[PDB]
């Protein structure tokens, strides 16, 4: 077909034009801008708590907005809300499907969400209407496994699925209000902007897309990774984000410059990144790895600052408290560790 041939020709011409436009803005690199900045030094965090009680491996955790409570999901079919200060378990929610792959805590603290190989995102009412915790709403639109979910607020949640789509939900109606399409592979993670007006998603096509929540369209597409992107997180400023992929590298992309700023990799690292997160100031990039450690990276320089080596199996999730007080890591050894 000549129509398909000329459409592909136009697409590659547009890609070349975009590449030229991005190249013209690369007057200098971030590495040489922050060359005179003093190094962060050596970061040595100790394990302060070890949360035990999960029977199987843990895929997801999410810190509460109060920086004290967190929720974790394990393949045994359990959601546990922990009191990280006292290591006491607050709730232990049995799941209808044991193949959970993600969990989200609501910013208000009234709800938790989970999903997985069953394509349903389940919302749980934490606050005691009568005393117990039960399923509040099930969202069954997706045709693939649920990989990530994040509450915009109460009654709004964004979910990424293996059907290569992201969706925006209304909890009371249970219906999708917006569908975000354009990824050609499984969407593995999403991160909400601080203002909750935009969110980025990393997929198995080695691409990250910046979406508009209100308009439901892809504003920008970021490339540069070589394998499936497993993790994504905004810089605390909101004008940048970091990704972690199976190609054993972490990359920092700038929204306004519309390109890559820095790559975080070492020759001794040949395993993929499963989770990334920033510190409170964004100076440190924390990445979990297929090998059982976590690496602390300088954000403004491409040099490692410290290592979190406490886990006996794959590190599957990590997160930093809203106040930056501590970082928690989940792992396939069925333990959560609080680092400080």
């Amino acid at each position: 077909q000549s129509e398909l041939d000329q459409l592909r020709q136009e697409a590659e011409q547009l890609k070349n034009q975009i590449r030229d436009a991005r190249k013209a803005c690369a007057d200098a690199t971030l590495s040489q801008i922050t060359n005179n900045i003093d190094p962060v030094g050596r970061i040595q965090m100790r394990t302060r708590r070890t949360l035990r009680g999960h029977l199987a491996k843990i895929y997801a955790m999410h810190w509460g907005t109060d920086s004290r409570l967190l929720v974790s999901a394990s393949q045994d079919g359990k959601l546990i809300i922990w009191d990280s200060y006292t290591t006491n378990k607050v709730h232990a929610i049995p799941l209808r499907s044991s193949w959970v792959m993600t969990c989200a805590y609501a910013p208000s603290g009234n709800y938790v969400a989970c999903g997985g190989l069953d394509n349903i995102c389940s919302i749980y009412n934490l606050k005691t209407r009568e005393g117990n915790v039960r399923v509040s709403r099930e969202l069954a639109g997706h045709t693939g496994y649920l990989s990530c979910c994040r509450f915009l607020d109460d009654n709004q949640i964004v979910t990424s699925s293996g059907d290569t789509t992201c969706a925006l939900w209304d909890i009371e109606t249970g219906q999708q209000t917006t569908t975000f399409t354009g990824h050609t592979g499984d969407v593995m993670s999403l991160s909400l902007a601080p203002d909750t007006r935009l969110f980025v998603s990393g997929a198995c096509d080695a691409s990250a897309k910046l979406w508009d929540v209100r308009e439901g369209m892809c504003r920008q597409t970021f490339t540069g990774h070589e394998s499936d992107i497993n993790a994504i997180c905004f810089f605390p400023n909101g004008n940048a984000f970091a990704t972690g992929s199976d190609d054993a590298t972490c990359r920092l992309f700038d929204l306004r410059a519309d390109q890559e700023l820095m790559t975080y990799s070492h020759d001794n690292i040949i395993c993929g990144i499963t989770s990334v997160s920033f510190s409170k100031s964004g100076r440190l990039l924390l990445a979990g790895y297929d090998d059982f450690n976590c690496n602390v990276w300088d954000a403004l320089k491409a040099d490692r600052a410290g290592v979190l080596a406490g886990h006996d199996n794959r590190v599957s999730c990590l997160g930093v408290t809203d106040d930056g007080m501590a970082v928690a890591t989940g792992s396939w050894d069925s333990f959560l560790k609080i680092w400080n």
Partner: peptide
């Protein structure tokens, strides 16, 4: 890209005292 790098650097320094992990 230099401007974006400068903005990121400025944000990093303006919050260095509020980062417990630093």
């Amino acid at each position: 890209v230099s401007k974006a790098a400068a903005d990121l650097m400025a944000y990093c320094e303006a919050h260095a005292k509020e980062d417990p992990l630093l």
